[PDB]
Design a protein around this ligand. Structure first.
Ligand SMILES: [Zn+2]
Ligand SMILES: [Zn+2]
Ligand SMILES: [Zn+2]
Ligand SMILES: [Zn+2]
Lengths: 1134, 67, 48, 114, 96
DNA sequence: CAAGTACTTACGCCTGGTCATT
RNA sequence: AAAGACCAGGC
């Protein structure tokens, strides 16, 4: 009834069930669906009603209605909007939002009239692709292909103005928790901070600090090891001693304050630690005087006592710790939580608690598209209400009437969401600089693996310029949640991370059932318990708010786990943690937690019996899925901070069984340890043998590999579309690749790689590519480039039009050839367009005409594939032209293995020149033997061995990381069984001379992938081209015919050479040369009319003593810019 | 995407051996036996048929530009 | 030039055969690692 | 050593001298409460902090799955073989590596160091 | 070379067109440089102040005109100024 | 004459796409 | 088309 020695198929059966039900882009879709179904409604309803005044007006928004996406044309007729139409026409895949409004007008006539404005349109929310609201939801593959969408396309991206935008999950410190940190040299020794948000209902966060004021005293009060706890409240300019804060809540007696702070007075150490804080506040002894003490230190002290007291009470109740409560009588709960913070602080001060780890991932929450679009939507709805209230108020002074449809500006919601998703700056347009940037990037569609990696990405908001190493290091808590390998090199290393395969981000659940169950199933609330009984009882936290105490904690955890396993009161994404050593229990239903599914271990055996695998093997025509497996109490989601109280077995067959015992209390087991690796790192064959940096380099390189990025590339007119000719699925595969759909959309091809030093053209990292293979279609690719042009009417008589310019009708012209354009100004497909040739004929009627047609990029020489005409959003004519250029692999192109072995094609020998085996297998790619040994990439070698054994045998070998049944010796024996050397070597013959090579070369079929970096997209030459308008120096860039930069390090190098003349040529003659006339009496440049030869210097009436100075135009601009700052840089030549 | 005629490493035609490969695999044989029955002795040729992905079937599911 | 054109005759490689040792050396390496583990276990026990 | 509270206002009692009687009196400052004292020790500054860790340890840590357990060391009270052992896990651990054992089975809760 | 009284800006040197380019927009419009816009603001506030001084003003409108003019001169010279609002273009973007 | 504060600086080069404003 | 910002990437 168990799974021994059959485990390898069982774990992969359950993993396949997971990825069949959940999918790879589930976090995005679920976050957005929760946003639309729940967050939008909650935000609109929770917004305060509009109250206007004299008659009274009340406006209330009741319920939302998000329709499916539609496109309102010029005529205004609704029409369903397929996503491909959004991409092609540069539209926005958005769906309108209607809200029912009730307007109650009170005219003081004892009869108020209620008018209902039904289904009021207020904006258009962009709809995530393949969300529950997309028109692509629930459609079969045939239906999607009828809609020209690729069934493999994950979804999870919005479409804004035609582009595809992916919302990156943004990290944030976990709110509603107490974290005790220690600053390095601050005036505070230990600081407990709590970021408090009222169930994300309102406000971003209103944090609270409780610090301990170092060791240095305040003159005559601190004479011990460091004391005087102080509290930094929100909206208070300076710090407030904590005892004053406690007394401000109505707890006058120091015994009551201590009871809230210290839970057992039988521990004198904590009392000795808190006594000087009491001594500080001995002076203040009443509630009102304490509130005044707080208030007088606020943003602006009140003139009178009453105003100061009211402001202090408002700060204490509303903003200081709002998650515990914001409704009046909640002062006792706030006192208990503030005492908890001080108690954590005192624990850290005495040393009984570890200071909370900074980068501990249980302290981090990921905002997916749900919370982020909620954060923007709350602001935009606040703005819509503000504008409607402004309109009503300015219309009610007249006292005539008021209309909601006129008053509501739909542009607010529509354009705010559109801008935030498009530009990436998260917030209002007016506050772009203060806004977060880098969220909502463009979904890169070079390779399928790149699309998946972009849809599953996490972004630490910390600035990339930080020099501190700690926030970039791989924390231990990332195990199974974030790929240990995938992280971009450069200054964004460790801060842009990618999800592990099994990671799921909690979507959110309202914690009403958990509170109800706890109240019904024993538990004592903080109001109805004597403070002396709290020392020996556990503290139950739900979403961080302290809900009460419990006497029998073990039974509570057992019962709660039972409920979560059977999924009745507790949903599967809710985490429950029992901090045993600290007598705490934390239950989290908060959205943003990162969890992974782990098998449940009871006693010393899995709950995953043979029946479950039996029903999953019959997954079809049995309606057994992952959700049935989870609902049967077999698998359980474990988030990062419950993983601390979980003892995990890596594999069952080796750890559960009795041996010399290491741990006999396992609580969960891992499905397969290969799910720690993320999407782009799971393509690595035998990754456990490589050096880890090589795995990171491959993770970076796989997104840059080349292949069929989506099966409907024919319909999508996208810029920079590389499509490989003959992709091949790897012969040394990893099982994870079955779920990334890498077999269906391969990016690469298997090459008979020889690790040999043939002619020295493979030295350093370069490779020698067989010219004959590249001749027969090896690694050949197509480079589709799309050009978009838009007719427009800008001025009154200023009109753009697509029409072929005649030789003499347009004043502005270029030396290009216009003969390829048809009557419509658009080249028909099939026309072989070379560089500088005109693509889309276009001209503007000047107030006769001025050409604005689109040329090609330099040195492309492509052939037109597809030319499309439509109407854009504004109804003008819109053209998109795609040119394909077959890019045969030449000797500048870049090729990379699946192990970080990268290199340019050094030279392309022909087949006869290539070395050959006794059979006739000449290597397609020869890589350098020197690449391997230092960087210790061994997945490459074992992958060549496994490729040879697999190609001979006929199956596709398994390269799953931790398999323990695929050793090198096993592969070697299987290879020797086929007539080859066990180590993969082969006796090779020199193609030039015919002789055997005295050293046997290691030849094997290795999966090599072509990269987007091609030399024809990197080669630039400059000789007297264009200049900038301002600097009069060569432009910036390859596209602008610009010039290479002679930076400061170059001039330092030249000075070291002692090369004055070459330095002068580079920084004077090669760049901007200029001549100015300078007066001799004053160094200020002089007016110089050269044709009249009348050189005059106003300011001294000088006309004869003038000298010509050759200086760079940059120096002339520097001098004039100084002169506009009143500095006079006189250039005296005497 | 479509079956590469003329195996890259050596040159033997493996462009007519894909439909036969599919039929042979569908009927009885293991992949190695099907490759042998097609006379692909050299493992470079076997890497063509064995590791190919017939994306042209996915491409053909889409409607044409013109009927 | 001359050394590369001789290397055309001689040749150079890298492969699995160069990263595998004799079974005796695998045994010696495993025994050394296990002896080190037993030493570190003894040191942990001594510190405890 | 600890803090003694007043009986009327429950605010802290500060030490004082009774000049006429020559005796240590804990006097209140929120009110006029005065109490005879018996400890004769206002302040204690244990800088060496030679604190035994057994008082802090809570017996519920016995039912922690993640902690290791030995059958070699039995409990001194009930003789139960299994015992969950762990290091200090707190301050002063940078120069202390002694193990602390908590006995298993419900209701024993014995704890000792070896 | 430098007297103290010269340091107080009594005449503001308007930089020539080269320092502040006027890019031609398709032969139809002309987009101005950031210094040109700041100079436009300086000219507006200076003309308003000169007109108010001619009229008589109210000795506090003169104060706000002088404050605005001094701000514009300084922000043309230095926009990084702490404790002062950063100059913005027509949209929200700090001036160079 | 100390204690307080604010200011300035933080690799080089290169490639592409996107967007708002002109 | 222009310089400004951002993003991704290469060494
Ligand atoms: Zn002069
Ligand atoms: Zn072949
Ligand atoms: Zn008293
Ligand atoms: Zn015991």
């Amino acid at each position: 009834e168990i799974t021994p020695d059959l485990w390898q198929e069982a774990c992969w059966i359950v993993i396949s069930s997971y990825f069949d039900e959940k999918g790879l882009v589930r976090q995005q879709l679920d976050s957005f669906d929760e946003f639309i179904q729940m967050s939008v409604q909650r935000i609109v309803e929770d917004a305060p009603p509009i109250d206007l005044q004299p008659p009274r007006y009340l406006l209330k928004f009741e319920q939302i209605y998000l329709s499916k996406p539609t496109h309102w044309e010029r005529d205004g007729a609704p029409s369903p909007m397929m996503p491909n139409e959004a991409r092609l026409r540069n539209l926005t895949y958005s769906a309108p939002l209607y809200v029912d409004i009730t307007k109650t007008v009170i005219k003081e006539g004892e009869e108020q009239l209620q008018t209902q404005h039904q289904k009021t349109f207020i904006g258009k929310i962009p709809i995530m692709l393949r969300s529950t609201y997309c028109l692509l939801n629930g459609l079969t593959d045939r239906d999607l292909c009828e809609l020209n969408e690729c069934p493999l396309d994950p979804g999870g991206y919005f479409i804004i103005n035609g582009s595809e935008k992916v919302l990156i999950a943004q990290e944030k410190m976990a709110t509603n928790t107490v974290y005790v940190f220690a600053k390095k040299d601050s005036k505070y020794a230990y600081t407990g901070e709590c970021r408090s948000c009222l169930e994300n209902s309102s406000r971003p966060t209103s944090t609270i600090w409780v610090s301990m004021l170092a060791r240095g005293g305040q003159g005559a009060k601190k004479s011990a090891i460091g004391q005087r706890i102080v509290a930094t409240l929100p909206y208070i300019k300076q710090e407030v001693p904590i005892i004053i804060v406690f007394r401000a809540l109505g707890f006058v007696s120091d015994r009551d304050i201590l009871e809230h702070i210290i839970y057992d007075f039988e521990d004198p150490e904590m009392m000795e630690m808190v006594k000087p804080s009491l001594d500080e506040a001995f002076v203040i002894q009443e509630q009102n005087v304490a509130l005044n003490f707080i208030g007088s230190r606020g943003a602006k002290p009140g003139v009178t006592k009453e105003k100061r007291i009211k402001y202090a009470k408002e700060v204490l109740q509303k903003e200081m710790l709002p998650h515990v409560g914001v409704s009046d009588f909640c002062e006792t709960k706030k006192a208990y939580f503030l005492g908890y913070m001080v108690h954590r602080l005192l624990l850290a001060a005495l040393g009984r608690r570890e200071l909370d780890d900074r980068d501990h991932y249980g302290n981090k929450r990921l905002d997916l598209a749900g919370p982020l679009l909620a954060f923007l939507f709350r602001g935009m709805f606040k703005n819509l209400l503000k504008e409607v209230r402004i309109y009503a108020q300015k219309f009610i002074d007249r006292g005539k009437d008021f209309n909601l449809e006129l008053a509501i500006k739909t542009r607010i919601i529509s354009d705010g969401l559109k801008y935030s998703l498009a530009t990436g700056n998260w917030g209002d347009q007016k506050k772009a600089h203060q806004a977060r940037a880098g969220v909502s990037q463009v979904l890169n569609r070079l390779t399928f693996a790149s699309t998946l990696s972009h849809l599953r990405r996490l972004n630490s908001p910390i600035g990339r310029d930080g020099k501190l190493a700690k926030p970039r290091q791989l924390h231990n808590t990332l195990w199974g949640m974030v790929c240990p390998a995938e992280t971009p090199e450069g200054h964004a290393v460790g801060l842009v991370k990618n999800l592990a395969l099994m990671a799921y981000i909690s979507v959110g659940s309202q914690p009403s059932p958990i509170l109800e169950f706890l109240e019904e199933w024993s538990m004592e609330n903080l109001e109805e318990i004597s403070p002396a009984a709290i020392a020996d009882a556990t503290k139950i936290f739900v979403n961080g708010c302290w809900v009460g105490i419990h006497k029998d904690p073990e039974q509570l955890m057992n019962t709660l786990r039972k409920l979560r396993r059977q999924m009745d009161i507790i949903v599967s994404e809710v985490s429950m943690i029992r901090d045993i050593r600290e007598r705490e229990i934390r239950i989290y239903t908060d959205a943003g937690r990162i969890c992974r599914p782990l098998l449940i271990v009871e006693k010393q055996k899995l709950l995953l019996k043979k029946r479950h695998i039996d029903q999953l093997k019959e997954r079809e025509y049995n309606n057994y899925s992952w959700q049935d497996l989870v609902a049967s109490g077999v698998v359980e989601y474990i988030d990062t901070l419950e993983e601390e109280t979980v003892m995990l077995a890596m594999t069952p067959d080796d750890l559960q069984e009795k041996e010399v015992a290491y741990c006999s209390t396992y609580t969960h087991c891992e499905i397969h340890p290969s799910m720690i690796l993320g999407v782009c790192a799971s393509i690595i064959p035998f990754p456990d043998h490589n050096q880890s940096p090589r795995n990171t380099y491959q993770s970076a390189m796989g997104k840059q590999a080349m292949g069929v990025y989506i099966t409907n590339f024919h319909v999508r007119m996208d810029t920079l579309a590389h499509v490989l000719y003959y992709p091949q699925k790897p012969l040394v595969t990893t099982r994870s690749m079955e779920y990334l759909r890498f077999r269906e959309l391969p990016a690469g091809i298997n090459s008979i790689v020889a690790i040999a030093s043939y002619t020295g053209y493979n030295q350093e990292d370069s490779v020698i590519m067989n010219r004959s293979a590249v001749d027969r279609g090896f690694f050949r690719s197509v480079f589709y480039r799309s050009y978009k042009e838009q007719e427009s009417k800008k001025g009154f008589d200023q009109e753009e039009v697509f029409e072929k310019p005649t030789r003499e009708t347009c004043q502005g012209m270029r030396h290009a050839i216009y003969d390829k354009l048809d009557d419509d100004g658009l080249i028909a497909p099939g026309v072989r367009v070379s560089g500088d040739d005109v693509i889309i004929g276009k001209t503007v009627t000047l107030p006769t005409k001025r050409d604005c047609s689109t040329f090609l990029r330099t040195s492309e020489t492509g052939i037109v594939d597809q030319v499309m005409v439509t109407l854009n959003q504004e109804g003008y004519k819109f053209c998109k032209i795609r040119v394909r250029s077959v890019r045969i692999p030449q000797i500048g192109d870049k090729f990379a293995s699946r192990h970080g072995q990268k290199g340019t094609c050094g030279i392309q020998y022909r087949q006869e020149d290539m070395p050959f085996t006794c059979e006739g297998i000449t290597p397609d790619i020869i890589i350098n033997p020197h690449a391997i040994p230092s960087r210790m990439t061994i997945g490459h070698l074992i992958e060549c061995l496994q490729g040879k054994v697999s190609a001979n045998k006929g199956e596709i070998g398994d390269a799953t990381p931790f398999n323990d049944a695929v050793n090198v010796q096993k592969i070697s024996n299987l290879l020797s069984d086929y007539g080859y050397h066990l180590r993969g070597n082969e006796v090779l013959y020199n193609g030039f001379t015919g002789r055997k090579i005295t050293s046997q070369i290691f030849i094997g079929p290795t999966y090599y992938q072509r990269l987007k970096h091609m030399v024809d997209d990197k080669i630039h030459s400059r000789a007297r081209g264009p200049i900038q308008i301002l600097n009069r120096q060569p432009m910036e860039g390859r596209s602008r015919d610009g010039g290479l930069r002679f930076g400061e390090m170059e001039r330092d190098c030249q000075i070291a050479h002692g090369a004055a003349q070459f330095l002068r040529e580079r920084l004077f003659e090669a760049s901007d040369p200029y001549q100015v006339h300078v007066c001799n009496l004053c160094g200020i440049m002089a007016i110089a009319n050269t044709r009249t030869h009348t050189y005059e210097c106003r300011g001294c009436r000088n006309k004869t003593q003038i000298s010509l100075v050759r200086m760079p135009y940059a120096c002339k601009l520097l001098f004039q810019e100084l002169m506009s700052m009143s500095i006079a840089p006189r250039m005296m030549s005497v | 995407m479509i079956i590469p005629v003329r195996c890259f490493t050596c040159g033997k035609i493996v462009g007519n051996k894909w439909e036969a490969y599919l039929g042979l695999l569908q009927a009885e044989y293991t992949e190695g036996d099907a490759l042998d029955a097609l006379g692909l002795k050299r493992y470079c040729c076997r890497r063509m048929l064995l590791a190919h992905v017939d994306l042209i079937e996915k491409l053909l599911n889409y409607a044409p530009l013109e009927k | 030039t001359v050394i590369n054109n001789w290397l055309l005759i001689e040749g150079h490689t890298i492969g699995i055969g160069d990263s595998i040792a004799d079974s005796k050396t695998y045994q010696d390496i495993q025994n050394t690692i296990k002896k080190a583990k037993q030493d570190v276990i003894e040191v942990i026990e001594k510190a405890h | 050593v600890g803090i003694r509270f007043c009986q009327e206002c429950n605010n802290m009692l500060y030490p004082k001298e009774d000049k006429e009687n020559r005796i240590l009196l804990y006097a209140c400052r929120n009110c006029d409460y005065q109490q005879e004292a018996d400890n004769s020790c206002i302040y204690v500054n244990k800088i060496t902090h030679e604190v035994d860790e057994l008082t802090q340890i809570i017996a519920d840590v016995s039912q922690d799955p993640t902690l290791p357990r030995t059958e070699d060391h039995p409990c001194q009270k009930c003789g139960h073989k299994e015992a969950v052992f762990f290091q200090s896990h707190s301050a002063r651990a940078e120069d202390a590596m002694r193990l602390y054992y908590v006995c298993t089975a419900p209701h024993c809760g014995h704890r000792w160091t070896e | 070379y430098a007297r103290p009284e010269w340091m107080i800006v009594t005449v503001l040197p308007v930089p020539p067109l080269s320092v502040r380019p006027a890019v031609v927009m398709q032969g139809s419009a002309r987009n101005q440089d950031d210094l040109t816009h700041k100079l436009a603001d300086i000219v507006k506030i200076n003309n308003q102040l000169r007109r108010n001084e001619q009229n008589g003003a109210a000795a506090h409108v003169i104060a706000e005109d002088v404050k605005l003019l001094q701000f514009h001169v300084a922000t043309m010279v230095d926009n990084e100024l702490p404790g002062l609002p950063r100059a913005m273009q027509k949209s929200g973007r700090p001036l160079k």
